[PDB]
């Protein structure tokens, strides 16, 4: 595909009408048509005007005459808006009819009409001696040869030249012209080159490689720099054209090379002419940038001036020592030969040189246009490094990076109000235990709470990360945008809550349309009300989980027991409005009306009762745990005592406390009480606070006390802190594979040359850096890349310090990002439940392995894209056993990781468990190595297998993790599980295929049978929290949700010897 | 008024650069015609929209 | 829960643009936009209009010749 | 006066959210003024604004005359 292939032809001579045609090109007659008799355009941002007229008007002068028709007045008589195209049709008609071409129509078919200097005489009004020669013999302007059009002008003048203005392409501006083109009398090849050489003594010209009509024309210019944006355009179009022919592809190319030969000229020119002959590779890879294309040019050409290729700079300074000389590739030579044999006597540019183009191997990448650039940096890659100096990250304005505490969370509006359930499990609560739990609760209470718990659930409140639902709720209802919806529908629940408005819906799912002018102010919401609607969503669901519809039956009621504003009980009452005889009250002892005020226990006087109860009480008053145990025992006894359906809330979760509940509702005569531990979807993502849920049943309630529940769990195992909480920093400062960066995120500014370095030395902690250049002109590259702990228990194995710093100096300068608008990163990005809680589980096996004294080494079976590496120290060795991992010889020797990439045998005859190891099984006995389920059974009996295997070794330990059995019990309740599912019964993490879960007594009882010592552990909050503030991460809502009760059924089990 | 002030804040003169490109001061100073043989033109005969 | 938890940072240095931003800092191409560029706001019952400006520009000095200009003039 | 109130309002809320114990990209570490030379008036508000009073944390005060609010509360 080496020669060119082309069809070259002299546009501008076919673009010259039959004489014939001269009488009506105007198309008196008929409009204009936009696209087709003009281009009209209104840059509204540059408020400028753009008519552009296309065929052969394209090139047309205009007489003063034509400039003082109305026509030419538009644009300053619209300065705002675009011309409104019935005043453009219509002007430009009226005009289009006051021009009329002179000329002599004949019969010949070989004759053409010299439009150029018809037009040209014209507007002159015919004053010069062209214009004379014209008006008094108009069919010199009929032409057979295209040459001969102009050579009977001069013979006829007896001039050896004319000197044509150029059109103005748009032909509203009316500046003045940088150059005119000057038309010579030199009809054989010899008296072109004369005119050439004679044009090489005199300043400021140019001319073209070869010309139209095929008669020799030279661009004069007024100033220099008009001839620089002359040449720079040239430049463009024959790299284009070139790079067209490069391709192959057949073209309708006007003439081999587009590009200007300066005869005269300045430096800078001739630095353009010589670059422009390069076709350097810096084109074709979008590396200049063309905004300011002439100044993209000279710093191209400065590179090449000195060029580390010897090569292309000898080239290109032979090509500024000569820059009347026309260099060309030979594929462009080849193509002019073809020229000169159909057209024998055709003239081209005779001073050419014919060099050979120098290959350069380097693909810059390159993507001009807005878009940040998200790298994903490799750990390793053929640059080695040596004690890299740090790299300065300037500081950056907030005109461009914006730092948020908390990224809101993006979530369908229905997934707010799920919620989970947890049943109890225990028979009996023996007095040992009670006396064991009380002392755990009390010792609990008095020492309050992790501070890094309360950190994380007050930077993260529910409402402020439910806000851009709701407020986009009401921004849609306020232009009228939303319309169908059901009555009882979440989504009407939400539009309750969205705007203070009553609203009516004029039929099924039609809601009104909004009285004219009326904007109703969106409805107010405590950090407690999304959640306190949950609540009640929560008990509808719990009344019966068929139903769709939430609107409570009609001659029912309903309690909000907290109270202030309450504003969940006017959203509510607003909800139910089409409902007959729906009381709805709150009734705190700081209730402002609608609400009650009372304080609980009611009054022995006062009458209450309901259908449904939503408890939220909460002294604020601090207060001695024997206090607050009678307070909260009084709340869930009158809560149970006033309503068949309570829902309190409990804010110290203590098995203690919620077992001490238990044993008040089976105290209470003739009345047993079913009950369930919840949790919201809509409650804050790290509240332990926790929905008691109590309800008459006819039979008594087998196993109703608690024992390690979930809820309660994620209540207890959170404890005084030995630490500081982790804050998270922004550094500004690379140190070549230091690790001594705490947890948060690399942010700032690096010149672009510095940019593949800082690349090639984030890379070590950073996992993944999004890039971007502000602007075009702008030469700092911005960065942001958040530290992965998991990068750095991988990068920091050994010294090494190798990185792909080779393919990031291929993106400099356009290749690394560009993007205008201000960017908002956040200090605690959303995370997917399931990942933070492989996380949790990375932090629990990583501070248990760390407790461990002389082990050689971790074999993750199951392992992956090497994800369990955050686990393991980086003094030990690291293997792989899973078949799915890709292998990477280099950064495996470099990194210290063996990995087997074949399956795990998990029959015993095969197994193969080396003492001193630590072998981790994390949630992949589950499934088989293709990714089909594993049946329960199977799974047990791999365990069996495992431990039965680790029974010789002298040393070893097992973390083999599965699902428990309960969990499906509690989703089948539960309503927030938008990633967990139980299809057929079987759970269903993430895009996994469902599967079987074990049942944890069966399991233990199975390793009591093996006689291995065992340990049924899972993590606790301080690692979500240790995994929270490590990763730099926020647990969101439904996450928050459900992390409880999945976390606490997805035991680690703990095999050891 | 307005189209003056959005006229000169552009500058009151300008250079055309070595790339050819317009520079324009960005500053209101009064002319002067020491300035005709300086690299400075003024602004108003720019021809620049 | 008593120690008191916060990362310090002079927001009002942060507020201050890279030099090269200053060219287009008004974004001269583009109109400004409610709620990025400006926050207007018309109090129907105190009759009173309310213009605040976003970003760079909150902190800004009018020279006399500013506030001849007609958008100045508007809430009369 | 005015700008004391103001900084008291802005300190008060901000030593609310680090009490909470959440994190906060708070400024400085106590956003409210110091009088070098003032009126009594003036010392005054920087006394009651030093204090914390409960009364800001249970909305004893009304914000709409806040600067009243704040001598009435010194007074008391
Ligand atoms: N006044 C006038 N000028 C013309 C006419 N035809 C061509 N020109 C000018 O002649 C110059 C060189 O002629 P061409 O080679 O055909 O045009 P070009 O150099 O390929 O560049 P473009 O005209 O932009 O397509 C251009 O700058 C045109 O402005 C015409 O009919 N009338
Ligand atoms: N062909 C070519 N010659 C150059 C270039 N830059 C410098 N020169 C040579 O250097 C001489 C003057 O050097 P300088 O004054 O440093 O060039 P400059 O105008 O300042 O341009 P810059 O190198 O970009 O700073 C000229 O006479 C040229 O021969 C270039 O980019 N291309
Ligand atoms: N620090 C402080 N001193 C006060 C206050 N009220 C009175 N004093 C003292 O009392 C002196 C003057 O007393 P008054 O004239 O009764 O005070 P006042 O200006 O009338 O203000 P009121 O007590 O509200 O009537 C001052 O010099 C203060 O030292 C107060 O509210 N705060
Ligand atoms: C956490 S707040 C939330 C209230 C309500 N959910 C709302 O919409 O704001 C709980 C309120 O219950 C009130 N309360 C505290 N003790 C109470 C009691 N013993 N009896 C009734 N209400 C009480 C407190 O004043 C507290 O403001
Ligand atoms: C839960 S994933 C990876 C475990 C862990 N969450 C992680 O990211 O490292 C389990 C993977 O182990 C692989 N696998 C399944 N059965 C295996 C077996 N019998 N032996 C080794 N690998 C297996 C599967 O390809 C699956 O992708
Ligand atoms: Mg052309
Ligand atoms: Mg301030």
């Known amino acids: 595909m080496w020669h060119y292939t082309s069809i070259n032809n002299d546009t501008r ?215 620089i944006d002359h040449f720079a355009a040239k430049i463009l179009e024959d790299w284009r054209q070139k790079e067209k022919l490069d391709k192959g592809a057949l073209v309708e190319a006007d003439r081999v090379i587009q590009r200007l030969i300066p005869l005269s000229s300045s430096t800078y020119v001739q630095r353009l002419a010589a670059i422009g002959a390069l076709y350097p590779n810096e084109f074709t890879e979008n590396v200049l940038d063309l905004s300011r294309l002439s100044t993209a040019l000279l710093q191209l050409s400065d590179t090449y001036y000195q060029h580390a290729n010897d090569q292309l700079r000898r080239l290109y300074r032979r090509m500024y020592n000569d820059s009347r000389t026309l260099y060309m590739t030979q594929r462009h030579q080849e193509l002019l030969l073809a020229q000169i044999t159909a057209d024998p006597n055709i003239l081209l540019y005779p001073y050419t040189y014919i060099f050979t183009t120098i290959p350069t191997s380097m693909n810059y990448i390159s993507n001009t246009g807005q878009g940040r650039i998200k790298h994903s940096l490799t750990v390793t890659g053929a640059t080695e490094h040596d004690t890299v100096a740090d790299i300065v990250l300037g500081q950056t304005g907030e005109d461009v990076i914006t730092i948020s505490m908390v990224e809101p969370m993006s979530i369908a509006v229905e997934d707010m109000y799920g919620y989970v359930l947890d049943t109890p499990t225990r028979d009996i609560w023996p007095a040992d235990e009670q006396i064991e739990q009380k002392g755990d609760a009390v010792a609990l209470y008095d020492t309050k709470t992790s501070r890094a718990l309360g950190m994380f659930n007050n930077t993260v409140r529910i409402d402020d990360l439910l806000s851009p639902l709701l407020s986009l709720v009401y921004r849609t209802y306020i232009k009228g945008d939303t319309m169908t919806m059901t009555q009882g529908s979440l989504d009407h629940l939400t539009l309750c809550a969205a705007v203070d408005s009553d609203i009516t ?92 005020r009372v304080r609980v226990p009611f009054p022995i006087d006062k009458n209450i009762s309901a259908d449904f109860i939503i408890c939220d009480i909460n002294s604020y008053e601090d207060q001695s745990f024997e206090s607050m145990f009678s307070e909260t025992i009084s709340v869930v006894t009158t809560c149970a005592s006033a309503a068949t359906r309570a829902l309190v809330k409990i804010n ?293 297998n495992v431990a039965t295997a680790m029974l010789t070794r002298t040393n070893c330990v097992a973390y083999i993790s599965f699902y428990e059995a309960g969990i499906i019990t509690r989703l089948d309740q539960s309503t927030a599980h938008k990633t967990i599912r139980v299809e057929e019964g079987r759970l269903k993490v993430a895009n996994y295929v469902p599967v079987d879960t074990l049942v944890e007594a069966d399991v233990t009882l199975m390793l009591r049978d093996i006689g291995i010592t065992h340990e049924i552990i899972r993590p606790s909050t301080p690692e979500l929290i240790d995994a929270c503030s490590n990763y730099g991460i926020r647990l969101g809502s439904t996450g928050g949700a459900v992390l409880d009760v999945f976390n606490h059924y997805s035991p680690v089990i703990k095999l050891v010897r | 008024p307005v189209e003056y002030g959005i006229f000169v804040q552009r500058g009151a003169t300008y250079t055309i650069n070595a790339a050819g490109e317009f520079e324009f001061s960005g500053r209101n100073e009064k002319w002067d015609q020491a300035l005709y043989l300086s690299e400075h033109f003024p602004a108003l005969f720019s021809d620049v929209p």
């Open chain 1, 13 to 227: 001579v076919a673009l010259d009408p039959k004489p014939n045609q001269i009488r009506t090109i105007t198309k008196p007659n008929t409009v204009p048509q936009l696209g087709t008799d003009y281009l009209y355009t209104f840059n509204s941002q540059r408020r400028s005007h753009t008519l552009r007229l296309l065929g052969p008007f394209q090139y047309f002068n205009f007489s003063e005459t034509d400039r003082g028709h109305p026509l030419f007045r538009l644009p300053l008589k619209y300065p705002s808006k675009a011309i409104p195209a019935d005043e453009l049709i219509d002007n430009l008609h009226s005009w289009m009819r006051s021009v009329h071409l002179l000329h002599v129509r004949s019969e010949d078919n070989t004759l053409r009409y010299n439009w150029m200097l018809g037009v040209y005489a014209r507007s002159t009004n015919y004053t010069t001696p062209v214009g004379q020669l014209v008006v008094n013999a108009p069919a010199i302007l009929n032409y057979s040869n295209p040459q001969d059009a102009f050579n009977s002008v001069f013979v006829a003048l007896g001039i050896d030249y004319i000197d044509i203005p150029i059109t103005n392409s748009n032909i509203f501006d009316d500046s003045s012209t940088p150059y005119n083109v000057r038309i010579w009398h030199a009809p054989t090849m010899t008296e072109v080159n004369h005119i050439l050489a004679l044009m090489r003594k005199s300043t400021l010209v140019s001319t073209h490689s070869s010309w139209h009509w095929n008669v020799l024309h030279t661009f004069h210019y007024r100033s220099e720099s008009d001839m």
């Open chain 1, 505 to 596: 819906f004029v039929g099924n799912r039609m809601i009104a349309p909004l009285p004219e002018g009326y904007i109703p102010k969106p409805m107010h919401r405590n950090n407690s009300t999304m959640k306190m609607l949950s609540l009640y969503v929560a008990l509808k669901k719990l009344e019966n989980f068929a139903t769709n519809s939430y609107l409570m039956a009609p001659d029912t009621s309903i309690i909000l027991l907290g109270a202030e504003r309450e504003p969940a009980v006017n959203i509510l009452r607003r909800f139910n409005r089409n409902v007959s005889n729906v009381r709805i009250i709150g009734m705190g002892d700081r209730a402002v009306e609608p609400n009650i």
């Open chain 1, 652 to 944: 110290h979760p203590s098995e203690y406390m919620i077992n001490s509940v238990i044993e008040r509702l089976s105290q209470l005569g003739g009345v047993f009480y079913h009950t369930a531990l919840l949790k919201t979807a809509s409650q804050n993502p790290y509240s332990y606070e926790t929905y008691i849920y109590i309800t008459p049943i006819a039979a008594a309630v087998r196993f109703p006390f608690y024992s390690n529940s979930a809820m309660i769990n994620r209540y207890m195992t959170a404890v005084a802190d030995d630490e500081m909480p982790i804050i998270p920093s922004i550094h500004t400062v690379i140190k070549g594979h230091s690790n001594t960066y705490s947890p948060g995120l690399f942010c700032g500014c690096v010149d672009v040359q510095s940019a593949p370095l800082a690349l090639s030395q984030l890379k070590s902690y950073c996992s993944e850096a999004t890039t971007w250049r502000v602007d075009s002109d702008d030469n700092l590259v911005n960065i942001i890349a958040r530290i992965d702990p998991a990068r750095i228990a991988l990068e920091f194995r050994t010294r090494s310090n190798t990185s792909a710093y080779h393919e990031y100096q291929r993106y400099v300068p356009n290749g690394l990002g560009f993007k205008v608008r201000k960017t908002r990163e956040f200090r605690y990005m959303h995370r997917e439940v399931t990942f933070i809680h492989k996380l949790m589980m990375y932090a629990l096996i990583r501070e248990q392995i760390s407790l461990t004294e002389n082990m050689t080494q971790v074999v993750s079976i199951g392992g992956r894209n090497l994800a369990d590496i955050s686990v393991v120290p980086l003094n030990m060795k690291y293997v792989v056993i899973d078949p799915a991992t890709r292998i990477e010889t280099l950064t495996q020797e470099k990194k210290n990781i063996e990995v087997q990439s074949r399956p795990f045998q998990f029959d015993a005859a095969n197994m193969d468990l080396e003492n001193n190891s630590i072998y981790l099984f994390i949630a992949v006995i589950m499934n088989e190595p293709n990714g089909a389920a594993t049946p329960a059974r199977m799974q047990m009996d791999k365990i069996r």
